[PDB]
Structures are given as structure tokens and as C-alpha cells.
Amino acid sequence: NRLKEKYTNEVVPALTEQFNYTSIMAVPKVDKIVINMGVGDAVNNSKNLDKAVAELALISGQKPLITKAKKSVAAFRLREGMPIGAKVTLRGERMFEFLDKLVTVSLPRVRDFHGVSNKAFDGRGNYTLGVKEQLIFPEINYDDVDKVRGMDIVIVTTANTDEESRELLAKLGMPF
């Protein structure tokens, strides 16, 4: 990767400034993403959502799987069903194969007022995010984006520290 090295060496000061000093192997650290359609919407055919699964294979984190709702909504009659909106559930050095999109491509492409999401307080050092359309990822996105069916973006630190998580993402790439 590249942000392994600039991560650790650039947080060695922010080790001491933020909470833990001397826990030099185990400091706060990111965990993963999850990237989902989650639209609902399956009751029409579920097949348009089964092109949203090719939208998730198109953004190409990993294998685009789907979830079953626990109860099937009377207002949506969907009979629990497996297609609901897509799932990755992407983690690790693949995240480190994924974040340079986030910091130097994705929202600096979509140019929407530095994407402020300070509302994203997940209690303990995690941070949500969403998106409407994705004109992101050149030569992959286009000729099927007649409607981007959506995606959601949730980062998560190992730490329970929300503001140090703000300094952990906002350490690099995205102000809020």
C-alpha cells in the first residue's frame, strides 16, 4: 500500500497528542467499510436490484451478496427474500486498496462541498457516510449510469474515540 507507512509514521505524533502514548504496537486503527444499496425496492421485480448487484460487482469490492430482512414488511409484502440491496463488507488491506479513491479520487471527483458529515456520530469511534450517485472510478462507471441506484459508506475505527476518529480519517484526504 502507501498509507500504511504514512499512516503509522504520521500518527506517531498523533499518538502522543491523542489518547494513548507508549502503546506503540496497538494504537487506534481503522477496521473496514461496508458498501450497500440497501434500497428496499425489491417488490417491483428485484431484477433492477439485480442490476444493482452488478453495480456492486461494478464498484468491485468483492462478491456482491445480499441480505434477508428479518421480518417481511406488510407495507412491502416482500416475503422475506434474499435480494434487498447489496453487501460488501470489505475490509483490511483491501480497504487499503480502496481508500485512495476516498481521499484523492472519489469526493474530489464529485466536488460536492467537501462532503461534510460531522453528524456521523456512531457513539464509539465509528463514522457513517452515504452517497447518491457515483460518477466515481473512471472507465468503469459509465454507459450504465442512467440512474445510480445508490451506495452507503461506513468507516469504523478500532477505537471508541469519535473525535480521534475524526482526526483519523480527516488526518488524510477529507475535511468535514
Binding site: R2, E97, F98, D100
Partner: protein, 79 residues
């Protein structure tokens, strides 16, 4: 990894040129491809030459939107 990933990572013969900063592997887009350009499957220019500061919230701080605001709605000598 899965074994034999029948999902994507498929190599389009292109380049993730500059300040996306990626090259090519079993990989398909964005932040994934590789870290070098000094052999060049294709050469790193086709996307962009300006960085995340290509975002116009900060592009030399991006105060070229200024001036605006106080000539709204009256600093004038008519009427």
C-alpha cells in the same frame, strides 16, 4: 481473496494515472491497481494531473470563487 475470483479485479488495459496513483494488477479501478509507473503498461496521464485539491473546496484554497457576496445586493451609485 476467494480462490479464482470470478467476481471482478479484472484488468482493463488502462492507467490510474496521477493522484489516483495506481498502475495495474488483477484489479479494476481506483485505489487498487499497483504502485509504480516506471515500466508503463500505459503511461500515467489520461485521468488527471491535479490532486485531491482538484476538488474546488481547496485549490490554492479555491478562493477564485471570491469575489462574490457583498456586491450582493448593493454597492452601487444608481438611483
Amino acid at each position: 481473496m476467494k480462490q479464482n475470483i470470478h467476481p471482478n479485479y479484472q484488468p482493463v488495459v488502462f492507467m490510474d494515472t496521477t493522484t489516483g496513483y495506481k498502475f495495474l494488477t488483477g484489479s479494476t479501478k481506483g485505489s487498487k491497481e499497483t504502485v509504480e509507473w516506471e515500466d508503463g503498461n500505459t503511461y500515467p496521464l489520461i485521468r488527471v494531473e491535479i490532486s485531491s485539491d482538484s476538488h474546488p473546496f481547496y485549490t490554492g484554497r479555491q478562493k477564485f470563487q471570491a469575489a462574490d457576496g457583498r456586491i450582493a445586493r448593493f454597492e452601487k451609485k444608481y438611483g
